[PDB]
């Protein structure tokens, strides 16, 4: 009999409850005070320009039909009760393929406060999409949006509101950072209106300002690129006389650069616009190709083949010495201009 009272309460709530109709349909607009608790910001799949985010999507809305006066002030019910009542058809405008976890049972808590202020949180693996303009990649701060609204209802039917202050609504757990390469600087919240063919939708944009950490690509791409360039410069130090060794150096360096360029592009999506990394690769490609062109010029003027011993020998190429100083310098100035332009 202890649990019979709550059974009679729930059966009284669901008695005559039409879950197809929204609260205040025809009378008032539905205020959905919704906030997010990011349990963990899943890895950003930059290849598909999408990011996974694991959230406790809390959303609350007063429902005058679910009024009760019982021993308990809040009915912490199971997820089965959730499908029995009207929940907003909230969908993520950029949600590509997401799933609400239901293992072991559905992960949606349904809390009914005695006044009818429903609180309906669910756990979600929102794989949302960011329109990314990776032009400054990897040094590219992204405002990855999380736009969510009601698929069916218009702004005249349901309007979405934040539970707390807009800054104090999208909370993120401190330990929940599954971002392998990115770094969540913070979240900027905004609410607006989007025009559609069927009508006007209210939209709750949430720009997760992700700053991509170059530490993965500094060693993945940038260090091998720079080391390949300084290999092509190690060429210059090596004597002009050794034609197979210098030529094999130049060829191996440019071949390396080719494999690095394709490896770099493989990680990112096949966007038209060249990334900042692509410019860095192109300049490095210019440097290695310039080094090989430089040795081809030296060989053009390399009158003698036999090398120094202990009978006139070759002279150290004026181009060799000039490139010995210029190329490191030119690279350094390029690198300083590069990092200053993109980091700042």
């Amino acid at each position, epitope marked *: 009999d202890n649990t019979t009272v709550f059974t009679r309460i729930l059966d009284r709530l669901l008695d005559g409850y039409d879950n197809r109709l929204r609260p205040g349909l025809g009378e008032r607009v539905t205020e959905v005070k919704t906030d997010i608790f990011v349990t963990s910001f899943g890895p950003v799949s930059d290849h598909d320009m999408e990011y996974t985010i694991d959230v406790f999507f809390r959303q609350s809305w007063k429902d005058e039909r679910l009024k009760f006066k019982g021993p308990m002030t809040v009915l912490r019910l199971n997820n089965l009760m959730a499908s029995k009542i009207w929940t907003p058809d909230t969908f993520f405008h950029n949600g590509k393929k997401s799933v609400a976890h239901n293992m072991t049972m559905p992960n949606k808590l349904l809390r009914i406060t005695e006044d009818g202020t429903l609180l309906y949180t669910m756990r979600l693996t929102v794989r949302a999409e960011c329109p990314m303009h990776l032009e400054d990649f990897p040094m590219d701060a992204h405002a990855c949006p999380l736009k969510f609204g009601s698929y069916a209802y218009t702004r005249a039917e349901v309007v979405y509101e934040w539970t707390r*202050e*807009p800054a*104090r609504s999208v909370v993120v757990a401190e330990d929940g950072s599954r971002l392998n390469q990115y770094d969540l600087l913070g979240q900027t919240v905004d609410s607006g209106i989007v025009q559609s063919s069927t009508g006007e939708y209210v939209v709750m944009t949430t720009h997760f300002h992700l700053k991509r950490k170059i530490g993965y690509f500094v060693i993945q791409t940038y260090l091998p690129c720079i080391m390949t360039v300084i290999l092509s410069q190690v060429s210059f130090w090596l004597n002009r006389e050794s034609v197979p060794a210098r030529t094999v150096f130049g060829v191996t360096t440019v071949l390396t650069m080719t494999t690095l360029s394709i490896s770099a592009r493989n990680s990112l999506p096949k966007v038209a616009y060249a990334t900042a990394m692509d410019w860095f690769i192109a300049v490095c490609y210019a440097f290695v190709f310039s080094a090989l062109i430089e040795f081809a010029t030296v060989n053009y003027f390399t009158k003698r083949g036999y090398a120094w011993d202990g009978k006139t020998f070759n002279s150290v190429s004026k181009i060799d010495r000039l490139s010995r100083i210029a190329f490191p310098l030119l690279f350094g100035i390029f690198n300083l201009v590069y990092w200053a332009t993109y980091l700042n």
Partner: antibody
Amino acid sequence: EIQLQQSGPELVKPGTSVKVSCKASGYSFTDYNMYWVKQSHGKSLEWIGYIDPYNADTTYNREFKGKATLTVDKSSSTAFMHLNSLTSEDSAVYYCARKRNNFYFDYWGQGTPLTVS
Amino acid sequence: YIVMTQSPKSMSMSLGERVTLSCRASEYVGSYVSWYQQKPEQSPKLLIYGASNRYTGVPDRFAGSGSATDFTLTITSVQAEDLADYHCGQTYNYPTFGGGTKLEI
């Protein structure tokens, strides 16, 4: 047709405390949080603290923490503010606002002058 | 806390002239910036909500615009009644208002 009627002006001496009310009309008291705002004469508006009437939760300005206490009565629809340790710097006019959404403060109190001398 | 900085502290625009206000928050506030009219011995009255949208019953002369951190409230055809201090409020965080932009004929 929402009117936030306050207690009125008050004249006091330093050191004592003053309690100022805010009786909302029309919209249900529990539904919307009540924000308290201080208007120093010749100066801008300064927020003091908001009280969520339903569960009586409060949040206060850091500068106003301790000096201002927010208590809400729901049997009679009214939000009260207790101001303690009054000084010359606290002489100003106080309004009670209402937050309708995350955008705007819907309706404001008539105004409660407070004088300390 | 956020601080709202109304740039022109005082104005003396003539009646019917386009008079433009400018307000700037220190940090991001999104679209949650509101403009309020403070007539003397009167409580603030909402004039612009959500930066661009107009509150109900407001005359069309008050045109409000601007993106986050830079906002404008232009009275194209200002009359005698629409000449008083204006404060730009914000609610993206703990609310804070700005110094009144006073006017005089």
